[PDB]
Amino acid sequence: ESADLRALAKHLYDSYIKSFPLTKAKARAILTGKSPFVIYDMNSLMMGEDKIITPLQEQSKEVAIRIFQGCQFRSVEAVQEITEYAKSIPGFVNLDLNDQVTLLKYGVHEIIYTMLASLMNKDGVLISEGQGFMTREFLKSLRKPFGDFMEPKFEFAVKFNALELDDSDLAIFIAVIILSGDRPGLLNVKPIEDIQDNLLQALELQLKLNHPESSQLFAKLLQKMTDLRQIVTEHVQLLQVIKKTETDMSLHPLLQEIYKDLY
Ligand SMILES: O=C(O)c1c(Sc2ccccc2)c2cc(Cl)ccc2n1Cc1ccc(Cl)cc1
Ligand SMILES: O=C(O)[C@H](Cc1ccccc1)Oc1ccc(-c2ccccc2)cc1
Ligand SMILES: O=C(O)[C@H](Cc1ccccc1)Oc1ccc(-c2ccccc2)cc1
């Protein structure tokens, strides 16, 4: 029933609003003008780092290393809030715990990038809960291989943002991503597909109601999941070049655990 689906949509949204201080609405409100300092080069980064506690040993490290060490902090927090949102998805806590961990290891960064897109435009990304703006070309200018981390997230975000989703849309779309039945190592595929198919109905209903003059938005949205797997795939391959060139780069053990036996 359309009444059941709108209930599921509403449930996911209320749960999404509860778990994620980063919302498209707030991000868009900052990019609309409804103030942030701009890091566009080395000089402006140093000025800006002050205006956004880390040990002195970590502070004395290379700029490139420091930028990706610090994003890690918001990253692991995202993985925790994403994990809690997952549990609030009907049926998920009833999956086998091995399958719960597997969907979540494969899914968290696709969601992180989906939510990250709200903060990017074709020129830069809102940082520090919207207080700052770091440019895409300055990220590209970082020492190799660091200059290559972010550029494929920008290319996705420009296209993902062109669809003008609401948070109420994204609440369902990210639930769909977590409950993907074809992740490697899933024991019970069909209970997972059982929930997702029902989530794909909610998402379809939600797009027809929220985007009535856009007939194939659903199709475009579902394809972006291919973009996200490719961005994770690329991102992980880059982490190993970072294990071979960089050593002092302090990876976070939860990120280590997620990136084990993955793609
Ligand atoms: O903590 C931040 O605000 C931040 C950071 S941390 C940071 C930012 C600028 C200078 C030093 C550290 C970050 C780094 C990159 Cl390459 C891209 C986006 C970044 N952001 C924005 C961001 C938003 C959400 C999430 Cl999960 C991670 C990062
Ligand atoms: O610091 C945090 O707890 C979160 C972590 C998080 C990151 C991605 C998805 C879910 C959670 O990161 C944020 C990133 C941006 C923002 C934000 C807030 C207001 C306007 C724009 C961005 C808030 C939190
Ligand atoms: O993998 C992740 O969770 C993050 C994702 C992310 C990266 C930038 C902005 C928002 C999210 O990307 C990273 C890139 C490099 C590193 C890192 C940290 C310490 C040592 C080596 C690499 C950690 C995270």
Side-chain angles (χ1 to χ4, degrees), residues 1-104 106-207 209-242 245-248 250-263:
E1 277 284 50
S2 292
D4 293 330
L5 297 174
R6 267 214 294 195
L8 177 63
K10 198 220 159 53
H11 173 89
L12 294 167
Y13 176 79
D14 291 328
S15 174
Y16 170 115
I17 291 301
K18 190 167 84 59
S19 321
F20 305 127
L22 167 53
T23 68
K24 170 109 174 195
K26 303 208 253 152
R28 253 194 75 77
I30 288 173
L31 299 163
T32 305
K34 314 174 152 0
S35 176
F37 55 89
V38 182
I39 295 168
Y40 59 94
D41 63 359
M42 232 52 94
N43 288 357
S44 46
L45 169 86
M46 287 321 277
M47 287 276 259
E49 268 205 316
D50 206 53
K51 306 190 220 352
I52 65 187
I53 316 104
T54 62
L56 267 177
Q57 189 104 4
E58 293 309 303
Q59 286 168 77
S60 60
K61 267 188 229 192
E62 229 198 327
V63 166
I65 285 186
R66 264 189 292 162
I67 291 167
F68 293 95
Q69 271 192 179
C71 84
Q72 219 173 176
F73 304 150
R74 292 238 155 70
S75 266
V76 284
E77 272 87 75
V79 173
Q80 301 171 235
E81 295 275 56
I82 288 166
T83 286
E84 182 212 322
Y85 173 77
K87 284 138 129 206
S88 93
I89 298 169
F92 184 84
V93 296
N94 274 84
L95 271 37
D96 185 10
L97 287 167
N98 295 311
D99 284 355
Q100 292 194 36
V101 172
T102 293
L103 296 175
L104 184 120
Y106 270 75
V108 280
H109 279 99
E110 296 174 3
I111 302 187
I112 284 165
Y113 299 145
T114 295
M115 304 185 172
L116 183 55
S118 307
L119 300 163
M120 329 184 113
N121 74 7
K122 65 170 146 75
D123 290 318
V125 51
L126 284 172
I127 59 174
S128 147
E129 317 183 359
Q131 288 176 75
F133 187 77
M134 170 164 291
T135 68
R136 168 180 185 179
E137 279 308 318
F138 166 72
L139 278 156
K140 243 198 270 183
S141 78
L142 292 179
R143 171 173 83 76
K144 225 78 83 182
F146 290 100
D148 295 328
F149 255 127
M150 295 298 107
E151 181 64 16
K153 286 96 179 150
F154 280 107
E155 317 179 85
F156 157 83
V158 158
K159 279 127 53 195
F160 190 80
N161 287 341
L163 310 182
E164 300 162 310
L165 299 191
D166 287 303
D167 287 304
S168 84
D169 304 322
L170 300 151
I172 310 171
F173 175 64
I174 63 200
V176 164
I177 287 158
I178 294 152
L179 287 131
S180 322
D182 78 299
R183 312 301 197 169
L186 294 166
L187 323 173
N188 284 71
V189 314
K190 192 256 193 171
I192 291 164
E193 312 175 352
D194 278 356
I195 306 151
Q196 165 183 280
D197 297 346
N198 187 255
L199 290 160
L200 287 168
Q201 305 313 315
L203 176 61
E204 183 176 47
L205 183 69
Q206 160 77 21
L207 301 186
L209 316 166
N210 204 38
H211 303 266
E213 41 194 349
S214 87
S215 212
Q216 321 301 156
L217 183 61
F218 185 86
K220 270 166 241 194
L221 204 185
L222 260 54
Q223 212 254 314
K224 296 298 162 287
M225 291 165 105
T226 303
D227 301 297
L228 288 162
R229 291 183 183 192
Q230 303 212 262
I231 285 158
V232 176
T233 294
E234 271 203 50
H235 180 101
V236 166
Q237 173 169 97
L238 208 63
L239 266 307
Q240 280 96 244
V241 186
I242 293 266
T245 81
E246 322 306 318
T247 325
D248 55 337
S250 34
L251 203 35
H252 195 292
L254 195 137
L255 293 199
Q256 277 145 243
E257 174 71 356
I258 290 184
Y259 290 132
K260 274 171 198 138
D261 224 358
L262 176 133
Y263 294 129

